[PDB]
Amino acid sequence: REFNNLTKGLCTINSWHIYGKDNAVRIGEDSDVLVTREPYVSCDPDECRFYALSQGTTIRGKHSNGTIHDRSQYRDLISWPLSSPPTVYNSRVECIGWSSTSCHDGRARMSICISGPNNNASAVIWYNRRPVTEINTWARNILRTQESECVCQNGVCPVVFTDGSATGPAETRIYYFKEGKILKWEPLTGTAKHIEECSCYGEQAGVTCTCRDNWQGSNRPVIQIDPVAMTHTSQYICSPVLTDNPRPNDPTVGKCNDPYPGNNNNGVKGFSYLDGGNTWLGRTISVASRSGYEMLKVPNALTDDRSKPTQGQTIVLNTDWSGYSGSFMDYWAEGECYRACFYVELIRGRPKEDKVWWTSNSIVSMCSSTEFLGQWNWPDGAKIEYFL
Amino acid sequence: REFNNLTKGLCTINSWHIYGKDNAVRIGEDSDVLVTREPYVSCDPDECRFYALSQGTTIRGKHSNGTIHDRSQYRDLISWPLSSPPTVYNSRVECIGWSSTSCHDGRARMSICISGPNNNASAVIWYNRRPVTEINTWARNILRTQESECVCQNGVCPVVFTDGSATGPAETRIYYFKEGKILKWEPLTGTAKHIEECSCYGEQAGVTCTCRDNWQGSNRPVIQIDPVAMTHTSQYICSPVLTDNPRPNDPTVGKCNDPYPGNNNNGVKGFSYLDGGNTWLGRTISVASRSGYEMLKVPNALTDDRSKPTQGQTIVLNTDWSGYSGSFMDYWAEGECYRACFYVELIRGRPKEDKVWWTSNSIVSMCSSTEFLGQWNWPDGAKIEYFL
Amino acid sequence: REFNNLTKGLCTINSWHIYGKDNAVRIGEDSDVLVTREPYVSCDPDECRFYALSQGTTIRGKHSNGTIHDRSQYRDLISWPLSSPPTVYNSRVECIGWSSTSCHDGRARMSICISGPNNNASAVIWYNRRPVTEINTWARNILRTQESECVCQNGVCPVVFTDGSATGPAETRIYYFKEGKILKWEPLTGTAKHIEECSCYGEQAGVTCTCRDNWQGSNRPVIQIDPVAMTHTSQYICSPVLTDNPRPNDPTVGKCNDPYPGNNNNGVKGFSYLDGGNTWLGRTISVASRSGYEMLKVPNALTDDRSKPTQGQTIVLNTDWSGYSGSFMDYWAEGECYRACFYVELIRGRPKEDKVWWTSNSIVSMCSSTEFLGQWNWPDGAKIEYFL
Amino acid sequence: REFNNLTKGLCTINSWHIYGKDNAVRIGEDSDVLVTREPYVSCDPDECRFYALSQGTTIRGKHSNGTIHDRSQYRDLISWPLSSPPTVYNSRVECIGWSSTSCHDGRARMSICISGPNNNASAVIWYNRRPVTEINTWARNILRTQESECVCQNGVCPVVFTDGSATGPAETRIYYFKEGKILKWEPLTGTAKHIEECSCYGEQAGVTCTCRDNWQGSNRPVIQIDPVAMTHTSQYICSPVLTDNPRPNDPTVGKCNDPYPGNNNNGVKGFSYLDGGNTWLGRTISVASRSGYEMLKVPNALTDDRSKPTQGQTIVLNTDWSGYSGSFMDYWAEGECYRACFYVELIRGRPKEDKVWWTSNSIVSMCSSTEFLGQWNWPDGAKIEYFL
């Protein structure tokens, strides 16, 4: 009944605890589980759910051949119950498309999916399970959005979109929606430039997004959004603890307003929680492939160009496949602070495991503890040989 | 709690955006999807659902052999969640039969199903999930109805039925129901010479139906119904943009008050939105077979016998199978106008793809935008070789 | 919120219309459909459902081998949505056992199931989904009940049980329940000589049951119950239109107070609607086997020992398998009378089709119309060959 | 809306009636049933459900291979409707891990799952479907809890936890939670210190738990908890009817304050209802294998070291597999007492049936009757040879 306001700060993060795990690929070896990728998690006032882009086929089904491809007519944003797998029978379609975001504002949920050919894509903004607003491509080259949840404050939900070639004229915009309607949009300003796949969280009347720089992948760009003024700033994480993938090795000194020299072609969606001495960064363990995942406590990573880890937690061993990662919180939990959470996408199949013809994932998710908990590791758990 | 009244006009149609798509044939290659045909979409105040006639078997089931046939004791009207497939586990039976319609009046849903042998069929009218009224065949020759949603105003829901020859004069009746009871019926009047499979929508306290003249016409008949006076008139779409299938080639001048000659004893369910300058027609791209689908902006198509397209949008390529098409709208959405929507039945299997022994379909659905959106095309997406 | 009272009479029955049909055997050929038998239908104030005894296995499962047998530890009373099949995934277990009844009193549902070995069986009486009362075997020989719905008036629900052979020591009782608690029971009085598998309906503050006399199968015994006084009477249907199976051929003159001499210790559960000139009897078409099903209008069948048919309706052809049949009505429908309904069990597999190792069924169900509707026939529709 | 208080005593137990049975291994031979072990039952105010630890795979799935192991990253606590099987499509995940407990307080449900490697495990405590509190391992050796439901009084829910090696000996604590927050914990005082797998019930403002001695057991430890004072006592069951497994043969005289001489370390989770002359003990029939199950009425078992059976009931034949057992009650039923219930885990596959590569279970569950009812036996019912 009331729109949520971001009235709390983050809980103290002393470690991370298991929150959700779906075991999708294991279970899908002998049940009707949809092929997916680009998962996330998002909460309503009364429920938290798993989200992803379906490929319009089961994993065992013959149509799973070809699912390495990102964009097709057969994809849809689906949601399903926390830690259940995305099955044909339990998965609810939010909207049709191959790039998405979604968030609840306290009264109802906004979901956004983009569909089309690369040169003629469009977003449809759904609100309360009905289409409300559409937005045509402005740069005619893969209009695309966060692939994780947005965040609202008093009914205003900023969303980050990008359109444009990997090398070409790109334009990133922040749209501000309320009940699925456009209040305002703005082109990206500050020092962060060639941005995508923003992972956002809200606290203390502000939205923080950690993104990916598509021109040089090393230290991540950050957007700080004021949802009342409908303004933003941008910058890079200064810490020499680099969190894109592939990435150079960690130097001694990082960069605050430019990317640290990195590659151009193909980073990874990732996230962080930037909160002074309560700062944690996530990254893949490998510097070159989407393998492993760990969380590192890096006090003042945002502003301190010499900042190094003072604590850590392994999530996924380096001998296991990871993937995209992103932030979410339960903005409707009890208590005096918001508990940081995140998910890691555990990609199985193509290209790394090319004895199968499909690509899919499962999900692991964690939230923060004020305790210093023991750590385990959380693999996907399926055996590729079983699918041969 | 209150009956819906058709108080709004249509939104301006500047383009069509993706609404829903179930990918049912793809998915059903390896999951328990029911064989269907004659699908449609209908909204309740709090939800929109897909509808179709089940064939009482899944697609991989051996009882899928013989499913090209229309009429059997194993068919039922089913609904399921929007953009999900019609599965054995998520499909709710509305009623039993092989010709149907369904609509919600704001307070509850009326569903109608006809069953029986060709010479002894009967309609059962359900309201609030209970049978209320039955109507026996009046001409003993395949009693049949819309195969897409009806429309209500202040509790009054007109429905079009036909009984008699598909290839000659037959007896069409317009029934007016409230709460599943018959308020009145009328025989068809106006200049439409033959009527089947009306596709209807409501606005400004009237219902417009675009139908199929199976006897002689390749232009479509139109019924316009006043649900307050409980009266109707009929004519043809005057436009030389002919919308049945098979059909002759578009002439320069159409016919308003008689069927456009050239093709007899055949046709396909279709629809249009006939709103002055805001008029759009749907059709198969091919003139010979149920392949492709396009929307064409044809100002005043209803009344103007020389009207040609001023804009268009491809929905399904002519290299892909289409099928029936129909109109629906969400009469309980927010805003100041009703947004026009339609679906296209994407038929797969027999008779065009006769290496399988079944006939089934998937659904694609679109709604109007006030923007000028980029177009995609939306095939069924399944590979027939996978079913062999 | 209020207990239902039986305040209406029966609608005029001029024909029967299709109500529900699950096509369960067809569908279960390639989906996870539970093996069942002894089905029925029962309504809540807001929903009608299908009920049956599960066999704790799917049809295609290897444990379907041996499901000809009636009594095992793996059976339960399950309910599921009208006209869906009983699947693993959608079936709700009401209670455990191999004989059942169930009814709603207007405030909550009572369900009764019996389990045990033949010499030591017991009923558990559940109300509002919790067990309330239990009753031990009184004759130590297959304590058993209706296998169709009971009927309630002002919260009193009579239920007929039997315990004992058709030979040895044996006793039928009518228990009167309120909120699952025993008010009173009575041993069978009247001219009915043995009794099982009663099929009941309510009207004008009375419950009429048509039962099965398993010593001699010809004309059916009938129990008439006053749920206010909690007393009853019994007699036989006088009509020479005989309705059990196996049965002798129809004579000229029937018997009112004894069975017309019939096939010994064999039977089928059946039903009738007894209402003067508005009397209809159901029966198998075959006099030898559970084959075909018809409805016959036999005015004053209860009291007129020469009454023959004035009207009829074929439900299942004699070249198709039938089974148990029973009565139910929607006591919470709109209008001024109760509409008579029935179901027929369509038994497939053993013993009549022994190339499969299983026994299961599907359901067809009809309700009365005041119109004279055309007739179809409603076979199960599965092909046994497909299961080989 | 209110916290439940334990204001009632136990009903008189004169026999046990069938309550629920899921037939999970039978059904799962040909449907998507999840592999489980460590089941139990727990009620909310409006529903009772089955619970267990999933193994993150179906039984027919290839990942069922290896499911003899207890502790993996692929386990979760799931719940599903009473007497349905735990399927991929109807199981709801409560939390992730490999040891659990769950209970409702009248207002919401608390669920505790522990995960981690043997030396670094942690509990997350969920309340109203959100994580609230975490507890790290205190002895670094398989932190572990009840594996059946907890009981609440006025919002306070005691839970027993164990950490430590069985040869340590191990340490036990009682935590007292309210709304998922720790009110208090205390170490095990008294005569029984080496305790695990507590099965609890509530009555007359106190909680009684029957457990497994992990040091030197035969007879079972008992903890009596006062949830208001948040204090406890401990002793052993004096009776010479020994209810662990393996165990020596029943002696004439038992032991109240020390374990009866028997096995080293290993045992089985079990339960009792200790209520003076209305006292019943559960045990496996077999002295050495998890085979069979029986209830024995053993007056004053708790306090009388010569007490022997005055009445019994076979639940599972000795020639059939059993497993864990535990107590639960419906604290929200009608009437003046709480009705004692329990479940038995029916283990199939490894180690006993090693011709399959998996280990799973089904459930049978019973509630007490004040009647003297006939007994049956309730096997799992699956044929292993079907799975080969």
Ligand SMILES: *[C@@H]1O[C@H](CO)[C@@H](O[C@@H]2O[C@H](CO)[C@@H](O[C@@H]3O[C@H](CO[C@H]4O[C@H](CO[C@H]5O[C@H](CO)[C@@H](O)[C@H](O)[C@@H]5O[C@H]5O[C@H](CO)[C@@H](O)[C@H](O)[C@@H]5O)[C@@H](O)[C@H](O[C@H]5O[C@H](CO)[C@@H](O)[C@H](O)[C@@H]5O)[C@@H]4O)[C@@H](O)[C@H](O[C@H]4O[C@H](CO)[C@@H](O)[C@H](O)[C@@H]4O[C@H]4O[C@H](CO)[C@@H](O)[C@H](O)[C@@H]4O[C@H]4O[C@H](CO)[C@@H](O)[C@H](O)[C@@H]4O)[C@@H]3O)[C@H](O)[C@H]2NC(C)=O)[C@H](O)[C@H]1NC(C)=O
């Ligand atoms: C990103 O996405 C974008 C958004 O989707 C996409 O843009 C869209 O592109 C599509 C594909 O091009 C466009 O869709 C087409 O729209 C056409 C209509 O629009 C054009 O034409 C009209 C009208 O033109 C007449 O009128 C004007 C005004 O007087 C004259 O100036 C013209 O010369 C012309 O006059 C002729 O016709 C008159 C009667 O109309 C006669 O009186 C006269 O004498 C002449 O003969 C113009 O208004 C339009 O201009 C406006 O928009 C354009 C952009 O498109 C601007 O450049 C311009 O400045 C204006 O703003 C425009 O030119 C449809 O006609 C077209 O559909 C036909 O073609 C397809 C095949 O392509 C057929 O499938 C379809 O059936 C239609 O053709 C059949 O039917 C007609 C009618 O009977 C027949 O004449 C024709 O021969 C053909 O018949 C044959 O096939 C039939 C089918 O099988 C069969 O049944 C018959 O029997 C027969 O065999 C199509 O829908 C779409 O609108 C664009 N949308 C927008 C918003 O721009 C963009 O491309 C995307 N980007 C990328 C990179 O992909």
Ligand SMILES: *[C@@H]1O[C@H](CO)[C@@H](O[C@@H]2O[C@H](CO)[C@@H](O[C@@H]3O[C@H](CO[C@H]4O[C@H](CO[C@H]5O[C@H](CO)[C@@H](O)[C@H](O)[C@@H]5O)[C@@H](O)[C@H](O[C@H]5O[C@H](CO)[C@@H](O)[C@H](O)[C@@H]5O)[C@@H]4O)[C@@H](O)[C@H](O[C@H]4O[C@H](CO)[C@@H](O)[C@H](O)[C@@H]4O[C@H]4O[C@H](CO)[C@@H](O)[C@H](O)[C@@H]4O[C@H]4O[C@H](CO)[C@@H](O)[C@H](O)[C@@H]4O)[C@@H]3O)[C@H](O)[C@H]2NC(C)=O)[C@H](O)[C@H]1NC(C)=O
């Ligand atoms: C049960 O569970 C618990 C709870 O989880 C387990 O305890 C946890 O154990 C893990 C594993 O050890 C710890 O994670 C590591 O944390 C460290 C940070 O902590 C260390 O450093 C702190 C800071 O030191 C600085 O300050 C001090 C004084 O101020 C000064 O002395 C020092 O020199 C420096 O200036 C120390 O404060 C801290 O000490 C404290 O904690 C100790 C226990 O951890 C305790 O003994 C102490 O007494 C004290 O209280 C401690 O020394 C992270 O640095 C580390 O992360 C690095 O290592 C992992 C591999 O382990 C790697 O994957 C990470 O990426 C990272 O290393 C890379 O990045 C570095 C930064 O650039 C770079 O230097 C490295 O060369 C390396 O980079 C290379 O690889 C990366 C990745 O591939 C690549 O990108 C690069 O380019 C390059 O090739 C871990 O996160 C947990 O914190 C700890 N938790 C707790 C609460 O204790 C416990 O072990 C479990 N028990 C059992 C039995 O198993």
Ligand SMILES: *[C@@H]1O[C@H](CO)[C@@H](O[C@@H]2O[C@H](CO)[C@@H](O[C@@H]3O[C@H](CO[C@H]4O[C@H](CO[C@H]5O[C@H](CO)[C@@H](O)[C@H](O)[C@@H]5O)[C@@H](O)[C@H](O[C@H]5O[C@H](CO)[C@@H](O)[C@H](O)[C@@H]5O)[C@@H]4O)[C@@H](O)[C@H](O[C@H]4O[C@H](CO)[C@@H](O)[C@H](O)[C@@H]4O[C@H]4O[C@H](CO)[C@@H](O)[C@H](O)[C@@H]4O[C@H]4O[C@H](CO)[C@@H](O)[C@H](O)[C@@H]4O)[C@@H]3O)[C@H](O)[C@H]2NC(C)=O)[C@H](O)[C@H]1NC(C)=O
């Ligand atoms: C479209 O749909 C419509 C609607 O469904 C279809 O029309 C329906 O058609 C069916 C099929 O014919 C009819 O069902 C049969 O009904 C008759 C009863 O109606 C007839 O008899 C009435 C009574 O006659 C008596 O009284 C009158 C005066 O009252 C007197 O004149 C007369 O001489 C006699 O003494 C007549 O009133 C009635 O006439 C009326 O209706 C006619 C329409 O039918 C109309 O033309 C007339 O103008 C008039 O208005 C009519 O003549 C049932 O008797 C019959 O049931 C018997 O036969 C079937 C086989 O068809 C069998 O399965 C039944 O069990 C039963 O016969 C067995 O039992 C008898 C009693 O013991 C016994 O005598 C028989 O020998 C036989 O016994 C053997 O078999 C059984 C079973 O296996 C075994 O147990 C025994 O031992 C033994 O071996 C049918 O139910 C419908 O009533 C009719 N509905 C309507 C509204 O019309 C229409 O056909 C469809 N259209 C198309 C084109 O397909």
Ligand SMILES: *[C@@H]1O[C@H](CO)[C@@H](O[C@@H]2O[C@H](CO)[C@@H](O[C@@H]3O[C@H](CO[C@H]4O[C@H](CO[C@H]5O[C@H](CO)[C@@H](O)[C@H](O)[C@@H]5O)[C@@H](O)[C@H](O[C@H]5O[C@H](CO)[C@@H](O)[C@H](O)[C@@H]5O)[C@@H]4O)[C@@H](O)[C@H](O[C@H]4O[C@H](CO)[C@@H](O)[C@H](O)[C@@H]4O[C@H]4O[C@H](CO)[C@@H](O)[C@H](O)[C@@H]4O[C@H]4O[C@H](CO)[C@@H](O)[C@H](O)[C@@H]4O)[C@@H]3O)[C@H](O)[C@H]2NC(C)=O)[C@H](O)[C@H]1NC(C)=O
């Ligand atoms: C229809 O269903 C109904 C209802 O369910 C069926 O009726 C039920 O029938 C069963 C099976 O008979 C009964 O269960 C048994 O109950 C007895 C307890 O009752 C007996 O003992 C009572 C007390 O006896 C003592 O006191 C009296 C004086 O008070 C003294 O005289 C006597 O010598 C003794 O010292 C008697 O009061 C009681 O009699 C009453 O009831 C009778 C009917 O049962 C009736 O005839 C009488 O007139 C009177 O009314 C009765 O005789 C349990 O003891 C028994 O459980 C033991 O036996 C089973 C094997 O069957 C075993 O599995 C159990 O563990 C247990 O035996 C083990 O433990 C003992 C204790 O330590 C030990 O001493 C045993 O040697 C044995 O130990 C061995 O095995 C275990 C496990 O493997 C192992 O751990 C040890 O190390 C060792 O190796 C049964 O539970 C039901 O109570 C009864 N219910 C009712 C209401 O009647 C009916 O039969 C069904 N009808 C049909 C047709 O099927």
Ligand SMILES: *[C@@H]1O[C@H](CO)[C@@H](O)[C@H](O)[C@H]1NC(C)=O
């Ligand atoms: C939320 O915060 C805004 C400030 O921008 C305030 O106007 C609004 O009243 C607050 N919403 C409530 C009362 O929940």
Ligand SMILES: *[C@@H]1O[C@H](CO)[C@@H](O)[C@H](O)[C@H]1NC(C)=O
């Ligand atoms: C709907 O419109 C009718 C007139 O056609 C009017 O009488 C009725 O009051 C309206 N329904 C409501 C209550 O919205």
Ligand SMILES: *[C@@H]1O[C@H](CO)[C@@H](O)[C@H](O)[C@H]1NC(C)=O
């Ligand atoms: C039902 O009938 C009884 C009398 O037999 C009456 O007292 C009771 O209140 C009635 N229930 C209603 C009004 O629904």
Ligand SMILES: *[C@@H]1O[C@H](CO)[C@@H](O)[C@H](O)[C@H]1NC(C)=O
């Ligand atoms: C439950 O009992 C407690 C005693 O600890 C009491 O204080 C509280 O008021 C009771 N709550 C109720 C009435 O539900």
Ligand SMILES: [Cl-]
């Ligand atoms: Cl592998």
Ligand SMILES: [Cl-]
């Ligand atoms: Cl193909």
Ligand SMILES: [Cl-]
């Ligand atoms: Cl057959």
Ligand SMILES: [Cl-]
């Ligand atoms: Cl076996």
